Amino acid sequence: SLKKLDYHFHSHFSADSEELPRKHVTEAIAHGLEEICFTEHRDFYFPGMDFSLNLPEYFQEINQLQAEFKDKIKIKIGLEMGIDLRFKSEINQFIDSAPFDFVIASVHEIGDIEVYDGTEFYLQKTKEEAQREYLLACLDVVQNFENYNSFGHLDYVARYGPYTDKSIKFAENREILFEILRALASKEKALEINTRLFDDPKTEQFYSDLLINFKRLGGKFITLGTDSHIAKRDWLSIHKARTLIKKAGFHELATFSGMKIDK
Ligand SMILES: N[C@H](CO[AsH](O)(O)O)Cc1cnc[nH]1
Ligand SMILES: [Cl-]
Ligand SMILES: [Cl-]
Ligand SMILES: [Cl-]
Ligand SMILES: [Zn+2]
Ligand SMILES: [Zn+2]
Ligand SMILES: [Zn+2]
Ligand SMILES: [Zn+2]
C-alpha cells in the first residue's frame, strides 16, 4: 500500500496563499497522513506578481512544527520552483542556498506571459495550440534543467483559459508527452500526480494515460500532491489518484530528504 502523504501544498509563505502552516499539519494528522512536504512558491521575475520566499522565516516556522509534531507525522520542507531557462543560474543559486528536502520544477509562465485565467497566453489561440506551446516549454525545461526532484502538474494548462471544455487529452499530445515522460525516466526524475482537477473524469483519464506510459518508458518515481492553498482538502480526489497509481503498476510513492530519494 502507498504511503499516506501530501507532497504539494502552500501556506502563507507563498505569495498566493494565506493559510496557517499549523492548520495543514493538524488536517494532515486528522486524516492519518504519515508524511507531508510544504512546497512554497519561488518564481523569478514573475509577470504581474512577486513570488518571493522568506527562507529564514519559512525554515524557522516549519522547523518548530517538525519538533512539536515529531511523534505524530513526518514533516519535510520543500519548494515549488517555477522554471524559466533564461534565469537558470539565478534559479540554481536559490535552490542551492537552503537545505530544501524536495523540489518540484513547474512551468507557470512562458516568455513573460503567465499561463493563467485572463492573460494573453490564451488570447486568439486554440486550446490545442495552447497545450502544444505549454508542453514544448515543459520539454525544454526537462531537457535543460536538472536541479529538481519531481515535475509539477503536466495538466496545468488545462486549469485555465476561455475554452468551454478545457480538458487535455493524451492522444492529441502523444508525441510530446512521450518525449517528456521518457526524458524524466531517463534522468531518474519523479512524475507528480497533481490532484487539483481530479473532480473531472477527464483529468483521471489524462493522468491514467500519463502513468501507464511513464511506466512503459522506464518511469520509477511518483510523487502525489493536492496543490492545496488552504488546509481543507479534497480527499476523494487524492484517493482516486492513489487508485490510478496502483493500477498503473507503481507500488511505492517517492519521498525525499535533502533532495535525495528516501530508501
Ligand atoms: N502559479 C500560481 C498558481 O498556483 As499553483 O502553480 O496551482 O501552486 C499562479 C498564480 C496564482 N495567483 C496568480 N497567479
Ligand atoms: Cl490519503
Ligand atoms: Cl524575483
Ligand atoms: Cl541544472
Ligand atoms: Zn500557488
Ligand atoms: Zn504550480
Ligand atoms: Zn503549487
Ligand atoms: Zn486518505
Domain ranges of the chain: 1-263
CA angle 93, 38, 150 (to 5 degrees): 65
Ligand nearest, relative to CA of residue 43: 3
CB 142 within 8 A of CB 184: yes
Phi, psi angle pair for 35, to nearest 5°: -155, 140
In the numeric block, the cell 507563498 is attached to: 14
In the numeric block, the cell 499561463 is attached to: 115
Measure the CA–CA gap between 184 and 152, rounded to whole angstroms. 12
In the numeric block, the cell 487524492 is attached to: 238
* Three cell numbers, residue 83: 522554471
User: Strands, E, within the chain: which ranges?
Assistant: 5-6, 35-42, 74-82, 102-106, 109-110, 113-114, 150-151, 190-194, 222-225, 256-257, 260-261
In the numeric block, the cell 535552490 is attached to: 95
Measure the CA–CA gap between 178 and 123, rounded to whole angstroms. 27
Resolution of the structure, angstroms: 1.9
Closest C-alpha to ligand 1, atom 8? 227
- Method by which the coordinates were obtained: X-ray
Measure the CA–CA gap between 64 and 62, rounded to whole angstroms. 5
Q: What is the largest CA-CA distance in the chain?
A: 54
Strands 260-261 and 256-257: antiparallel
Measure the CA–CA gap between 139 and 183, rounded to whole angstroms. 8
Measure the CA–CA gap between 32 and 144, rounded to whole angstroms. 38
Measure the CA–CA gap between 106 and 103, rounded to whole angstroms. 10
Strands 109-110 and 113-114: antiparallel
Q: Judge if the beta carbon of residue 46 lies within 6 A of ligand 1.
A: no
Measure the CA–CA gap between 239 and 185, rounded to whole angstroms. 25
Which residues are found with C-beta within 5 Å of the ion, ligand 5?
16
- Ligand 1: which of 7, 81, 103, 108 to mutate, most ligand atoms within 8 Å of CB? 108
CATH domain 1-263 topology: TIM Barrel (3.20.20)
Q: Judge if the beta carbon of residue 192 lies within 6 A of ligand 1.
A: no
User: How remote is the CA of residue 16 from the centroid of ligand 1, in Å?
Assistant: 7
